Coordinates of C-alpha atoms in Angstrom, one line a residue:
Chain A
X348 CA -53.8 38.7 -124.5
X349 CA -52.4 41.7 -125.9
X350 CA -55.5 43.5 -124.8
X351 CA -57.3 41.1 -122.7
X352 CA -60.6 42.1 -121.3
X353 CA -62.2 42.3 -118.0
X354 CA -65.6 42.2 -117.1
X355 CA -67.1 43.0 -113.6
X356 CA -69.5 40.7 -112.2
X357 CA -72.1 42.0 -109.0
X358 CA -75.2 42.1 -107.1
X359 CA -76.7 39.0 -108.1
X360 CA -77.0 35.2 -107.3
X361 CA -74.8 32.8 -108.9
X362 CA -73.9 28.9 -109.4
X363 CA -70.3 27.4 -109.9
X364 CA -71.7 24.0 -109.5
X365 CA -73.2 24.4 -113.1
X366 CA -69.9 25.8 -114.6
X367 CA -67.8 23.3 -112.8
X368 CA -69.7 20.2 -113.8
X369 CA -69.9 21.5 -117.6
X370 CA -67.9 18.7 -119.5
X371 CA -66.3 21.9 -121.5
X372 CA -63.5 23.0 -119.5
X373 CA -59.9 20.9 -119.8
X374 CA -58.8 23.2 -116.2
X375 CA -61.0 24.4 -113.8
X376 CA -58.4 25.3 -111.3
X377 CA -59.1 26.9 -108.3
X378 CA -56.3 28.1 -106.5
X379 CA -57.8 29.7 -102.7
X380 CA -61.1 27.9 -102.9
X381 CA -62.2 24.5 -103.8
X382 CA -64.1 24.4 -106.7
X383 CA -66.9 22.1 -104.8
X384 CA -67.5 25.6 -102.1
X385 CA -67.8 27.9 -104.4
X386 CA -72.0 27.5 -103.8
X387 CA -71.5 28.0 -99.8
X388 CA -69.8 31.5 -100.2
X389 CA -70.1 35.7 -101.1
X390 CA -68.0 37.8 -102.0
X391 CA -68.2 42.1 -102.3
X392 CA -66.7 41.5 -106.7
X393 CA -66.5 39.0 -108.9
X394 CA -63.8 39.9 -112.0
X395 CA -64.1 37.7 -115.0
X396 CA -61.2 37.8 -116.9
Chain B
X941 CA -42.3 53.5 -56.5
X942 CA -41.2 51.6 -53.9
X943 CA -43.7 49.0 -54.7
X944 CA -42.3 48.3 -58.1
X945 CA -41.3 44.5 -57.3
X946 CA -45.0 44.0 -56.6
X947 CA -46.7 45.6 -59.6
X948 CA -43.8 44.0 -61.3
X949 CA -45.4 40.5 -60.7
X950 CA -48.6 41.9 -61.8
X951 CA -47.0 43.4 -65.3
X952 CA -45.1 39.8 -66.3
X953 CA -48.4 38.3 -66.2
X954 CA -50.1 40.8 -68.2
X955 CA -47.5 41.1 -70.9
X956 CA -47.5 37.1 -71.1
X957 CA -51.1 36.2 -71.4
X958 CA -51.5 39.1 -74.2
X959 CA -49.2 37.9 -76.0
X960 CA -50.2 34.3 -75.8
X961 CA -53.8 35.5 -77.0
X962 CA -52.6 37.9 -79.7
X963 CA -50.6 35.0 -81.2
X964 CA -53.8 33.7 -82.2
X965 CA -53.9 36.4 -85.1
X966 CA -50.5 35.1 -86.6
X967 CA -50.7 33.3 -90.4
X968 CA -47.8 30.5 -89.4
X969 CA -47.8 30.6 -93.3
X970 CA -51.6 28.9 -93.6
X971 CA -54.3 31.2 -95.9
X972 CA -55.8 32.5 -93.0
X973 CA -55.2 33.1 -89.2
X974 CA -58.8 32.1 -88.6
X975 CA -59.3 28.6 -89.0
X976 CA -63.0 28.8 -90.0
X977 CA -61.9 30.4 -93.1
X978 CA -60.0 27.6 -93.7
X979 CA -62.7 24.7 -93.2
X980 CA -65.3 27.2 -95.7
X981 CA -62.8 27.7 -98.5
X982 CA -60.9 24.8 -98.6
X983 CA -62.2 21.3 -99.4
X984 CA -60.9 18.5 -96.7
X985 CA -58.0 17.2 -98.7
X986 CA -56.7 20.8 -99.4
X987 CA -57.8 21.9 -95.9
X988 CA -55.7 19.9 -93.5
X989 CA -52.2 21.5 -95.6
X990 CA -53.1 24.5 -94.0
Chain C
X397 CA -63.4 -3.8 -112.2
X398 CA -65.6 -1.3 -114.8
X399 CA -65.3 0.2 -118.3
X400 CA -65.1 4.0 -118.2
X401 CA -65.3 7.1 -120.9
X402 CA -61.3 7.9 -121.0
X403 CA -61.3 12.0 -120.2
X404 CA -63.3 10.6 -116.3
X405 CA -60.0 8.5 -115.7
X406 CA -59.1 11.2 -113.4
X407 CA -62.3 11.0 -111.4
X408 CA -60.9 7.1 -110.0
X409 CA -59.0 8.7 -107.1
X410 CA -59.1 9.6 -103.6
X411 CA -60.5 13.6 -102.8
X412 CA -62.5 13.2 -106.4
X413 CA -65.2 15.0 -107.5
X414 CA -67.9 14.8 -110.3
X415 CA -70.5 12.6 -111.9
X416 CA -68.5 9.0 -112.0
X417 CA -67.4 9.9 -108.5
X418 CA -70.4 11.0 -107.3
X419 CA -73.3 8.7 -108.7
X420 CA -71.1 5.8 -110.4
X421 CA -68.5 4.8 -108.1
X422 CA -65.6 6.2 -105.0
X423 CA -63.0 5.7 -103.1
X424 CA -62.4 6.4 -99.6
X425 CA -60.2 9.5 -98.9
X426 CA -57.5 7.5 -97.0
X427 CA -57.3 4.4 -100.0
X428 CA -54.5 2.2 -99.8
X429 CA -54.0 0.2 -103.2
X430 CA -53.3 1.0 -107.2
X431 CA -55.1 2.5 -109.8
X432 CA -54.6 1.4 -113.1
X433 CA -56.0 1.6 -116.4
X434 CA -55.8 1.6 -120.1
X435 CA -57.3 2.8 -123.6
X436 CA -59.8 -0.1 -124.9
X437 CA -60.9 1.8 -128.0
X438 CA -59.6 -1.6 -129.7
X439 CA -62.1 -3.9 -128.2
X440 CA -65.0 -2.0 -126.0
X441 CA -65.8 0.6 -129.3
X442 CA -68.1 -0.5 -131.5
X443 CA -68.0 -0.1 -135.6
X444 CA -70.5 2.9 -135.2
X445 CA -71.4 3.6 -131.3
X446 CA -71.4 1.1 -128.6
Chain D
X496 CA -55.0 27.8 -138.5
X497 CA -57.7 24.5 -137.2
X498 CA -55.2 22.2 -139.1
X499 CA -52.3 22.9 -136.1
X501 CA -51.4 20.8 -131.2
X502 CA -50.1 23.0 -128.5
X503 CA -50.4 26.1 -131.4
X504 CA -54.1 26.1 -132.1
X505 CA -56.6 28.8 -130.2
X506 CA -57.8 28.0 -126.7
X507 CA -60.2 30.0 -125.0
X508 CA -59.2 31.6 -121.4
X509 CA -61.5 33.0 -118.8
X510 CA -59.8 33.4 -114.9
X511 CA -62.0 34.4 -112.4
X512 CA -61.1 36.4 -109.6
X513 CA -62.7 36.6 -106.0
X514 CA -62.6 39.8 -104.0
X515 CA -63.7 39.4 -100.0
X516 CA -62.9 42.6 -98.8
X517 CA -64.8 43.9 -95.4
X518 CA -68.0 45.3 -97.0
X519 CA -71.2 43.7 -97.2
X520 CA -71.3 41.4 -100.1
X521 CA -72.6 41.4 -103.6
X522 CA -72.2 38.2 -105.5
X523 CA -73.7 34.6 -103.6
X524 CA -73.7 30.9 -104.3
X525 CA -77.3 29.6 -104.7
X526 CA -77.3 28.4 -101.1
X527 CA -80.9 29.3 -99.8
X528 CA -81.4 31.5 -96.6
X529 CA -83.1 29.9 -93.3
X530 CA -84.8 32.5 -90.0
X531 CA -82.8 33.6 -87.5
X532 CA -83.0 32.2 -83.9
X533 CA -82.0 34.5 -81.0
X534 CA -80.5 33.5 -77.8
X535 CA -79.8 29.3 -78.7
X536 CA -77.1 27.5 -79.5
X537 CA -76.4 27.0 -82.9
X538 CA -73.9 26.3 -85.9
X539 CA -74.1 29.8 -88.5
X540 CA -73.0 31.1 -91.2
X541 CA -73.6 35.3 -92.1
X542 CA -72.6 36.1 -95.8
X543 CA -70.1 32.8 -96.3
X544 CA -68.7 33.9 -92.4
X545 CA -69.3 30.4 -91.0

């Protein structure tokens, strides 16, 4: 976190259903979406932190 | 000019049904002024807050 | 009444989501009642894997 | 060190969702259907429901 790094996510398909049902996550909080809609929507950038 | 009490009843009108429509663009302090942005985002739970 | 892995406690409550919550078992999203619950790792584990 | 609770390593990644007024780049796995002019219908264009 001194130097933490960004990747830019775009033009592709995509499923959160498979990330949010992975049992490896102790958070998966979603703060202006619920994590269940994330599979209904697009969106111009995605920015992985 | 003279007319100005007449066009006057026509200007009250106009001013007040603008601004009753143009209210609709107003956050009230939800996520988004329009509410099917709301009910696409937000799970049901989450949804009625805003 | 049921027997449950510890870490899908959370799933047992209205607005849930997941596998126990989904295939397993659910609540409706208005319930009105308690939830309660408690580690059995004393008596439901096994001496190698139950 | 792995020996530490609240001071050993976790692993962060936050993801950040842009929906700016462009056409999109990044979709959920939702599946497309036709278009049908000139009926009444419930839609959804890009997430735009």
């Amino acid at each position: 976190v001194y130097a933490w790094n960004r990747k830019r996510i775009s033009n592709c398909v995509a499923d959160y259903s498979v990330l949010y049902n992975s049992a490896s996550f102790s958070t998966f909080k979603c703060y202006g979406v619920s994590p269940t809609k994330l599979n209904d929507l697009c969106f111009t950038n995605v920015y992985a932190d | 000019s003279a007319l100005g009490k007449l066009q006057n009843v026509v200007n009250q009108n106009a001013q007040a049904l603008n601004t009753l429509v143009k209210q609709l663009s107003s956050n009230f302090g939800a996520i988004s002024s329009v509410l099917n942005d709301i009910l696409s985002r937000l799970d049901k739970v989450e949804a009625e807050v805003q | 009444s049921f027997v449950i892995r510890g870490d899908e406690v959370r799933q047992i409550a209205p607005g849930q989501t997941g596998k126990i919550a989904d295939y397993n078992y659910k609540l409706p999203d208005d319930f009105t009642g308690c939830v309660i619950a408690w580690n059995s790792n004393n008596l439901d584990s096994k001496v190698g894997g139950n | 060190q792995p020996t530490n609770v609240g001071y050993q390593p976790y692993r962060v990644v936050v993801l950040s969702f842009e929906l700016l007024h462009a056409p999109a780049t990044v979709c959920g796995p939702k599946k497309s259907t036709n278009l049908v002019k000139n009926k009444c219908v419930n839609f959804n264009f890009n997430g735009l429901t």
